[PDB]
Amino acid sequence: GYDRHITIFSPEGRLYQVEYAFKATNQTNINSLAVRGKDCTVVISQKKVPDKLLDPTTVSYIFCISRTIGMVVNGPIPDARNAALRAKAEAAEFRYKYGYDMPCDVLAKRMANLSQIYTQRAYMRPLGVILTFVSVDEELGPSIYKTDPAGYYVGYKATATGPKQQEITTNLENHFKKSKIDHINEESWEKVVEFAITHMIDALGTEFSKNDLEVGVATKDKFFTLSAENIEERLVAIAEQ
Amino acid sequence: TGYDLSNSVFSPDGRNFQVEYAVKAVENGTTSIGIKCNDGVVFAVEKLITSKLLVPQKNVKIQVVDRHIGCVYSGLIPDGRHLVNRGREEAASFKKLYKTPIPIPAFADRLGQYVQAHTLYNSVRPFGVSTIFGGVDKNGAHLYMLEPSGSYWGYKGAATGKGRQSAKAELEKLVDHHPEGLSAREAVKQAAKIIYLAHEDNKEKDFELEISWCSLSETNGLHKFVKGDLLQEAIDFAQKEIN
Amino acid sequence: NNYDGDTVTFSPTGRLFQVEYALEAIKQGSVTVGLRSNTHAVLVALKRNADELSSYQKKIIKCDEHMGLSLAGLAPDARVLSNYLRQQCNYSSLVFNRKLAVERAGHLLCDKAQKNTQSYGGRPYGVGLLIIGYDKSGAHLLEFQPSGNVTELYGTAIGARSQGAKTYLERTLDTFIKIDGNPDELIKAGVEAISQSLRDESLTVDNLSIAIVGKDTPFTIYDGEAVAKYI
Amino acid sequence: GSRRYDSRTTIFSPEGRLYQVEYALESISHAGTAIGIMASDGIVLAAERKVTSTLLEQDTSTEKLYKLNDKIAVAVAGLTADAEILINTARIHAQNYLKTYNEDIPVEILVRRLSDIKQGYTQHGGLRPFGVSFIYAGYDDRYGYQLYTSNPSGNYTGWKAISVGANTSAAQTLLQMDYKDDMKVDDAIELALKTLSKTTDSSALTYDRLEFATIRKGANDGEVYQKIFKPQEIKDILVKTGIT
Amino acid sequence: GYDRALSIFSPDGHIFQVEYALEAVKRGTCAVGVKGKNCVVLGCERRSTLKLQDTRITPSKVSKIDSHVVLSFSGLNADSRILIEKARVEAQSHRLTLEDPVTVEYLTRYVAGVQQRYTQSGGVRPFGVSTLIAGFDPRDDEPKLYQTEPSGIYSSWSAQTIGRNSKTVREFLEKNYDRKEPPATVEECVKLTVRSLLEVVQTGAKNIEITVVKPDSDIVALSSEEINQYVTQIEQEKQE
Amino acid sequence: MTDRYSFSLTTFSPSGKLGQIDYALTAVKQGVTSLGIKATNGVVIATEKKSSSPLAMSETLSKVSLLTPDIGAVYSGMGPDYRVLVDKSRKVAHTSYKRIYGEYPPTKLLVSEVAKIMQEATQSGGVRPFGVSLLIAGHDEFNGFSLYQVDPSGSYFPWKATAIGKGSVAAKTFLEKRWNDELELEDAIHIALLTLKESVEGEFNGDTIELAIIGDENPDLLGYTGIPTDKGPRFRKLTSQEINDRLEAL
Amino acid sequence: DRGVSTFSPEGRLFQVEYSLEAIKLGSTAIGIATKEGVVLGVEKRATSPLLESDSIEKIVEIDRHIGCAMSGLTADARSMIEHARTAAVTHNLYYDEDINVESLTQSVCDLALRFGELMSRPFGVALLIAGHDADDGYQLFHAEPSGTFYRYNAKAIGSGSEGAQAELLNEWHSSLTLKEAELLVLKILKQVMEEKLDENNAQLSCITKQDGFKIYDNEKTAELIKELKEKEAAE
Amino acid sequence: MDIILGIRVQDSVILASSKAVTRGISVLKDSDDKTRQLSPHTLMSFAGEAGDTVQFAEYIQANIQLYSIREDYELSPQAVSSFVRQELAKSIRSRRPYQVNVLIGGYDKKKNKPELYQIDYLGTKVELPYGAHGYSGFYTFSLLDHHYRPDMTTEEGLDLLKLCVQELEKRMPMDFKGVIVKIVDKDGIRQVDDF
Amino acid sequence: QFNPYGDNGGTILGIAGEDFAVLAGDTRNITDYSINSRYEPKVFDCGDNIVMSANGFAADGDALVKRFKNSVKWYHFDHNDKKLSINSAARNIQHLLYGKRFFPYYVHTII
């Protein structure tokens, strides 16, 4: 069955390469999670540095696409960086052509269109990644938009991605059934970050030190990633709670 | 099945078997390492002395990129040279436009993205090398190791090829008992040792040691080869430590 | 076996079978020896005829006044590669008024052979080459191979039964490395080496091809009557 | 590389047949039957729709009969989408001819060029052939009324009466039996319907499963008129020839 | 563009796509050409599982390339139109530059070159056609007849046949054609051309086509009537 | 590097099936149900917004898209394929019509262009067919109201009413029962909602149903006043609120 | 199936090696080189007696000083001959001189290997290129689809070649006259030819420094044939 | 080049074209035929820029001959004229335009009508009872305006031409070495051998 | 506006004896009213017993001689070390110069 090697239909109307690309998404064995505050959007991903020889500072799956947009990837790093560089190029071109910063959802759509092409044209393989895009958009406010190897995308109130993703998902749905609202009703990003980590701990049944996480935050007019110390401060705040 | 006959094809695992096969040719190669130090990086390689007919000192494998970046690799040597040629075009282009020499993380991704592009189509074969490289820039020292999938990270120390595990074992030891730093001159001795040590897993043929380094104090942030008295000095250091 | 249909496919053990089959054409090819002193470098090549009525295939090709090679394997591939080298020697001259360093000639061949081992629909080169020259840093011998692997040596040999001469040179090393400023003696030691690779036949007068380059010697090829002196 | 996934659409079988042409014809043999009949005073085109649903918009659809210019029309049997690509090409080609010579295109010349495009897809480029056969009905001042067929091979032939699509062996027998040369258009109309009536895979032939067209001299003195019948006009012709 | 080497060598040294193109020629309607003392005659079978054929408008199997050169063929009809077009184009280009109509050998050489080119170009299959090219060089009264085939080989023939059962009609021509004495008139040559087709045809009804080419661009297509007489005269000279 | 697949990936099998078109249709069969009904004074297209996660905001995912002020589209099958087709469909309305005639294309011709795009993915080198079927509802001055279905083959057919996807067999039967040629637009909306209740498992409300109409011109939606002959878009998306109003009277 | 430019495990190009088989099925071609000229002779092999044998052109002029004979898929030769003629006239245009026989042959053989995935397959025809130049006198070259060309004192290609080459291996000596060489080619052809050799089904040609490449007409050849039987009968 | 005329009478088209070919101060030739037969019943005369004239005529001729052979049919004069106009209309916006003016004289066998078409190098076509390109027109048009009748015989047409040529030899500054006259009728094209 | 030519002056002279030939040239190189060099050779040994001078615009002269010297080198490679006859050199140079017919080498050439 060469219908299992390139992106052409199988007899039951399926694209196996797209399906196998989704499988690669979890190779890194990393779970990611994103929630929206009132003023901010927070995206946390587990950080795992197995080999002691690595320089831990260069081990990241969160990317700074634009001034305002950040992206966390779930999937192998080469494909992740291919997606990162491309998204950066597209966000910069958009700003030059149209005279305003590329919105999160639009970049998400454009990357989704790119992904779609690989599902249709035979010479391009899909990238084995899932891209979660976050910002505080100037029209739509706090935003989460996620793209997969199918070329599918949609906006989220909150989301999770990875192997243990289903547990994190249902954990969050449970919080929002209770809370009755679209987001974390919290003033500062610092406390939204605490929420994100706290609910990741509950759902995974594990604790984290400062080196086990990696955190991204988008406020109005910038996206930035927390240093080890910023997270320690955040973890300590959680401890005394 | 047959998922492994064509590059860029995902297996049901989510794997690209051609890249994994590329790795075997790398694992088959001679040993090579790199060591990050206080203000620089040190590179070294094992060169199997195929025959007495090999002119000593004259089959250089460490390749310079720009004036500040060293690159060494284990695997298919021609594939390695091809990658450096590309790297040199990238640093030429980056300097041409931005005036400043290419920073190391910047350079890392240029090689990273290019190697990764050879896992995207079935009309190309992935690279048959793992590449250890780096140097000194406006932010200090950086060492990288790049693999056939296009995966790369920053390293405190790194190794690849036949003796990678013996090398990695000795590297972890250095890292543990020198948590405040290792001098550039020290790293040149340690490098010699670890190549002599990692040569045991590969010891039919005896071998030629080759070292290079960029240090902000010792070579002024430029890539130079280790030669003469300093080479012999580290050769002797390593000879002590095997007995 | 399943992974030998093209150059762009790796075997499960990490091999490139089309490159290995390309290497096989050299093995089938007639033997050629190269060796050097500090002042000269010599190529000796055994030429192979089709039958008793045919000329003996040329094995040695001039690249510049100071560089040249010998071939074993597909002759047309050597013509392509030598031509390419002639151009790089040319380019170095006309642009930089600079004779091309043998080391650079090595690197340039390596990268040219390499492109063919990584892309679809192409094929590796089916020939092995030994490059001798005399540049600004003395005498040189290079061994090219269609994998891309170029190797600087004091001496070597490639082709059919080359293993004989290759061991002899390895034994002779300290003798011939110092045949400095004597052309004839380096040639005869080359002729002696090639003799280790002969079976049921020895060196005749239109059978044998010798080339030499050195300090005050243009790369020049000796054939026919002008090698009788050396058998 | 990519060779491994190449069907090779443009090669010969050991018997010297073009596989993809043979299989396109086999595809075309399951399409709604189209019939062309040529009379001394006009041409008839009749085609059967692929089984209609009660809810399909009957009048605004054109599945089978298309206008190439004012003097030429085609009946289609095969993949509709493929047919449309070729039709727009034929229309343009007729307009290039009018633009170049200031005369309407001779029927064969248009037919030949479409057949040459089909031919190309079976010889070079490695693409699949067009899964389409046409019945060309048209008029010009050199040969008068003409019928042609072309098929995926790029072969074309002229006819007095001919059918394409399903049951053409049955239909060609019935046309061969009742067709006369002196025949007037109104008899040819009747023949076309009586022939579909018998070869159809449906229980009964009704107006809403038919496309019908004529090319007559039935306007004002030596000038030609194309008639694409509305639903009602077919429904009336069905009663007047006594099939309903 | 599409690149594949569709025509390639097999271990036995055969190019299967050229050989399979010959199978298409085998399956094509028969064709024969016979050259007289002062003329050439082209005859073509017309397959007879078809009435309702409108022969006013259906492509004639013999095609004029220039006014002094005619070409017929056996094999794929679609492929033949492409060769005929290029040949017609080249005919007019040779007139424009050399100021002289093509010799029959030249026209043959060109069409043969086209077929051959399609045997070793990527992305194309060979022409499923063999041709009989016949006519008179300009200001030359000696008759010409040539054969081409999918491989690109071509040559001159006193008389020759191609297509289905050509082996049968070649058999006939081989014992009924004297090299030393070609059919001395148009009459005689037409008869030998029709006689040969009658080994293989059926009734000589809507089943045989004949074109006669004389010197100085003097080509005339025969009609049912005239053919039919040769048919009846052949059959009543049969009762022995 | 670059595309070396310049040969078709859809070819005739010995039976004369086109495998990849057949399989694309199977992808459409799996897809979520969508429908369209044509009234005398308008057209309705409708589908279910079957949300992937409940954490998703399914209003950010529009299955029903404006193509021109007077034309709207909906699909069953693969969403990503739809989304790019909408992008191409919107652009071709401009490049190959509006930039030439200074007006938006009539429905059948925009459909014709879309069908062309989909036919080309069925024959061009190195691509698979589109895994969707589209229902395009639209208005234009000379043809009035129309409804078209477009399949992966590139074929299109005009409909009085129809459905595609999951429960299309049942849905068409139900539409045959109810459709007459005197339906007023509100009657068609009512029927559409009933038909869509059949093939909807869980929640059935204004947040899980996407429904748009091609109806009266909406000057309140045009964005400007002063040109009396410009009167605004006939394509209107019904709001969540508006859908729920008709569910109480269902 | 598998790439056109693929190497066998023995280190040979499949497509080249297969072309070599096609050449073995070809009609016989023989050339002999002497100090008085080079002779080129071929088997015409008419597939049927209705084919006019004089229209079988398997010996061909390249320039006045260079001739060529062929064996194999002879249609593949047309473009090789066309390149050769162009190269020979072109060289004379650039240099106001006759092109060398070896150079011409090298030029032709450069075409040979430029096929793949340029043309789609190698040539299925071998060529005996015979000529004369001032530098190296009379020369005969065997030009193959491998892109290799050999110089020969004598050579046979095509179906009768293993038998003909062994025959040539004995009969050639370095003082053959042109006459002797003509007779030798005639003699060896009649042996390996399926049918009986006459002036219609075999063709002779030579190239001399004085008169250049000439093809012999059937009268002159018929006399060399009559001459050949007389020497033979008389031993 | 310079002088080319045409008169369409009752049953024929008559084309008169000067024989002189001049470069600098030398009449290189005095018997030049400035005409190509495009098809048996269609003739084209031409004048303009050296080289372009013949190259154009022969290119057109080749295309019409190809058409004839392909379709075994002769294009009507109207159709040939439109083809020529379009070719000239293309050329005028090319890199280097064809600088050729033509007259197309043809007998349409279907209509049994003679037809004269005047086309300049811009591709400006008109159907005319009589026409001229160049300075000729300035004398001949007014002359023909007065002397031409629609129903004239071929013999009267030739006499009308003698009037035109007499006048041009009287008043034109250059020596154009007489004309070559050709008649296009229902029986094809023939040339008058003395004029 | 840029003028791609210049005049470097000098003058050359060739004469044929029975079994010898000369090519003389002054060694002065000028532009306008200045001397650039009192000794800048413009007559060259080009191998195969051919001497050549391209006098006029120096940049073009050097370009031509370079290309002819390269032509000779390649003639040896491609034609088995054959000697380039003076007539064949003459014809070769015609093609070098005419190659640039529409942007010529401004030189008077003598071999």
Side-chain angles (χ1 to χ4, degrees), chain A residues 3-223:
Chain A
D3 62 306
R4 288 164 182 276
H5 293 212
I6 53 176
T7 61
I8 67 176
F9 288 116
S10 67
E12 51 279 334
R14 280 165 55 174
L15 306 176
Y16 280 95
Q17 285 293 296
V18 176
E19 294 184 8
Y20 303 158
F22 270 95
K23 255 164 209 159
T25 257
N26 290 339
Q27 262 198 353
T28 57
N29 193 207
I30 278 330
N31 297 267
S32 87
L33 175 175
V35 292
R36 308 179 312 174
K38 255 148 58 94
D39 265 20
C40 61
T41 304
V42 177
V43 55
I44 72 162
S45 166
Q46 293 177 255
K47 183 174 172 155
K48 282 177 189 171
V49 193
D51 196 343
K52 269 185 287 147
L53 295 190
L54 295 179
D55 176 5
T57 56
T58 69
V59 186
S60 179
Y61 290 85
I62 296 194
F63 294 92
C64 293
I65 299 316
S66 72
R67 159 139 298 148
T68 57
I69 301 185
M71 175 190 75
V72 64
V73 182
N74 285 79
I77 194 66
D79 284 10
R81 291 169 175 155
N82 174 117
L85 180 60
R86 183 50 172 272
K88 285 161 175 171
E90 297 282 332
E93 181 177 317
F94 186 99
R95 176 56 188 76
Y96 167 77
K97 276 195 174 138
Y98 306 108
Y100 69 97
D101 297 323
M102 196 179 201
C104 185
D105 53 301
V106 178
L107 169 58
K109 175 177 195 193
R110 170 63 182 165
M111 295 304 289
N113 288 154
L114 255 30
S115 284
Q116 186 283 151
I117 290 165
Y118 318 146
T119 76
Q120 183 150 214
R121 212 112 82 210
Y123 85 114
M124 293 278 355
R125 79 168 168 79
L127 302 161
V129 287
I130 289 171
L131 315 170
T132 311
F133 293 96
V134 292
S135 82
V136 178
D137 191 64
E138 73 197 309
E139 280 191 53
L140 299 183
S143 292
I144 308 167
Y145 284 86
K146 192 163 74 199
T147 283
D148 59 38
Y152 169 94
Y153 95 105
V154 65
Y156 293 85
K157 314 182 175 149
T159 202
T161 305
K164 311 277 277 279
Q165 151 263 123
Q166 185 47 51
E167 284 101 304
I168 309 168
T169 303
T170 31
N171 180 303
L172 298 163
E173 303 166 359
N174 285 139
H175 178 268
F176 287 116
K177 205 226 225 76
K178 176 171 191 150
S179 84
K180 208 94 270 169
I181 47 170
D182 253 18
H183 54 95
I184 308 317
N185 196 260
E186 201 74 60
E187 308 297 356
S188 68
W189 60 268
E190 287 99 336
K191 299 208 77 69
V192 173
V193 171
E194 282 159 24
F195 177 99
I197 298 180
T198 277
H199 285 248
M200 170 148 273
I201 285 179
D202 300 354
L204 299 190
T206 46
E207 206 88 55
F208 308 109
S209 74
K210 54 174 187 175
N211 301 316
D212 300 322
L213 298 175
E214 125 172 284
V215 186
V217 185
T219 50
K220 203 208 157 187
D221 287 321
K222 62 178 303 208
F223 169 83

Side-chain angles (χ1 to χ4, degrees), chain G residues 91-100 102-103 106 134-136, chain I residues 71 75 78-80 82-85 87-89 91-93 95:
Chain G
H91 178 95
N92 166 250
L93 186 57
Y94 294 167
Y95 295 108
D96 182 29
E97 75 184 3
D98 278 358
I99 188 166
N100 283 173
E102 188 222 61
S103 296
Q106 181 59 268
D135 291 331
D136 293 343
Chain I
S71 191
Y75 186 85
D78 294 321
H79 300 87
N80 185 225
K82 188 192 179 173
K83 206 203 193 200
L84 189 72
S85 48
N87 69 288
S88 302
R91 178 63 68 74
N92 186 240
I93 296 167
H95 280 82

Side-chain angles (χ1 to χ4, degrees), chain C residues 177-227:
Chain C
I177 188 50
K178 258 157 281 136
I179 302 169
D180 292 6
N182 202 153
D184 289 51
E185 280 297 280
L186 229 201
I187 293 188
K188 256 174 175 183
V191 164
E192 188 161 317
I194 198 164
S195 293
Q196 310 317 307
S197 304
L198 313 165
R199 301 249 263 284
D200 311 40
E201 211 208 333
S202 29
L203 323 164
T204 85
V205 91
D206 41 52
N207 197 14
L208 169 70
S209 205
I210 304 149
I212 186 160
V213 67
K215 204 207 156 147
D216 290 298
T217 343
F219 180 102
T220 43
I221 306 161
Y222 297 128
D223 276 311
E225 218 44 79
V227 298

Side-chain angles (χ1 to χ4, degrees), chain A residues 7-10 12-15 116 119-121 150, chain F residues 10 19-32 34 63 74-85 117-119 121-122 127-134 150-154 164-166:
Chain A
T7 61
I8 67 176
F9 288 116
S10 67
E12 51 279 334
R14 280 165 55 174
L15 306 176
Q116 186 283 151
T119 76
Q120 183 150 214
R121 212 112 82 210
Chain F
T10 304
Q20 289 288 315
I21 290 158
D22 286 11
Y23 306 161
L25 284 154
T26 304
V28 179
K29 270 261 79 164
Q30 303 332 128
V32 162
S34 56
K63 292 183 79 192
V74 79
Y75 82 103
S76 291
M78 311 183 62
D81 280 22
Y82 171 72
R83 195 183 58 251
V84 316
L85 278 169
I117 288 156
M118 290 170 75
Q119 189 280 333
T122 250
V127 291
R128 57 158 179 84
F130 287 95
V132 299
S133 286
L134 307 165
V150 193
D151 281 349
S153 71
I164 50 163
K166 230 149 170 69

Side-chain angles (χ1 to χ4, degrees), chain C:
Chain C
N1 139 76
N2 246 98
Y3 310 78
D4 69 331
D6 48 53
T7 343
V8 84
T9 299
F10 265 119
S11 75
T13 58
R15 311 157 63 181
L16 302 170
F17 280 102
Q18 275 295 298
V19 179
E20 270 152 49
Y21 300 173
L23 267 21
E24 198 61 50
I26 304 154
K27 246 51 57 61
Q28 311 309 316
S30 186
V31 64
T32 176
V33 175
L35 78 169
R36 78 162 189 82
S37 80
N38 291 289
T39 62
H40 298 71
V42 181
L43 286 172
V44 202
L46 168 57
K47 301 190 275 170
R48 168 182 293 161
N49 62 342
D51 65 19
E52 212 54 47
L53 255 25
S54 82
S55 60
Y56 291 74
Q57 188 94 323
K58 317 203 318 296
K59 301 276 271 176
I60 296 175
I61 299 155
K62 187 172 175 192
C63 284
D64 206 343
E65 296 305 312
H66 73 104
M67 196 177 290
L69 71 236
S70 64
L71 73 99
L74 277 169
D77 287 25
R79 173 158 165 74
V80 167
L81 290 176
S82 68
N83 193 254
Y84 171 76
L85 241 178
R86 281 159 162 188
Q87 275 157 0
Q88 295 301 300
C89 285
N90 250 228
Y91 185 85
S92 190
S93 294
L94 297 165
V95 177
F96 295 97
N97 193 230
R98 179 181 207 174
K99 308 196 70 164
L100 184 67
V102 173
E103 170 145 22
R104 271 201 86 245
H107 300 317
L108 292 161
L109 279 188
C110 166
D111 297 352
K112 206 226 198 313
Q114 197 283 154
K115 268 156 202 111
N116 286 216
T117 67
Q118 194 167 198
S119 318
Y120 174 60
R123 75 174 177 74
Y125 289 91
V127 77
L129 313 162
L130 306 181
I131 297 122
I132 53 161
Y134 193 87
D135 66 42
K136 265 214 174 181
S137 77
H140 302 265
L141 169 83
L142 253 52
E143 182 176 316
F144 164 83
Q145 236 139 234
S147 52
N149 283 288
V150 165
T151 307
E152 191 164 353
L153 300 147
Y154 295 110
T156 194
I158 57 167
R161 274 152 280 168
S162 74
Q163 187 55 284
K166 211 189 184 221
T167 312
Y168 158 94
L169 286 159
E170 218 174 352
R171 278 183 26 243
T172 315
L173 185 50
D174 310 310
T175 306
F176 77 76
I177 188 50
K178 258 157 281 136
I179 302 169
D180 292 6
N182 202 153
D184 289 51
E185 280 297 280
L186 229 201
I187 293 188
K188 256 174 175 183
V191 164
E192 188 161 317
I194 198 164
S195 293
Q196 310 317 307
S197 304
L198 313 165
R199 301 249 263 284
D200 311 40
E201 211 208 333
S202 29
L203 323 164
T204 85
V205 91
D206 41 52
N207 197 14
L208 169 70
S209 205
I210 304 149
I212 186 160
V213 67
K215 204 207 156 147
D216 290 298
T217 343
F219 180 102
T220 43
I221 306 161
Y222 297 128
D223 276 311
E225 218 44 79
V227 298
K229 188 213 286 67
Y230 294 112
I231 297 147

Side-chain angles (χ1 to χ4, degrees), chain E residues 7-20 119 151, chain G residues 13-26 71-74 76 121-126 145:
Chain E
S7 305
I8 56 159
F9 290 111
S10 272
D12 57 357
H14 297 140
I15 303 169
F16 279 141
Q17 278 298 130
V18 177
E19 273 171 19
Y20 300 168
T119 71
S151 71
Chain G
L13 289 170
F14 284 107
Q15 276 294 130
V16 182
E17 298 298 304
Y18 298 170
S19 88
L20 268 45
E21 289 308 320
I23 293 159
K24 285 169 184 180
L25 293 186
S71 169
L73 301 164
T74 57
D76 287 22
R121 59 178 181 76
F123 299 114
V125 64

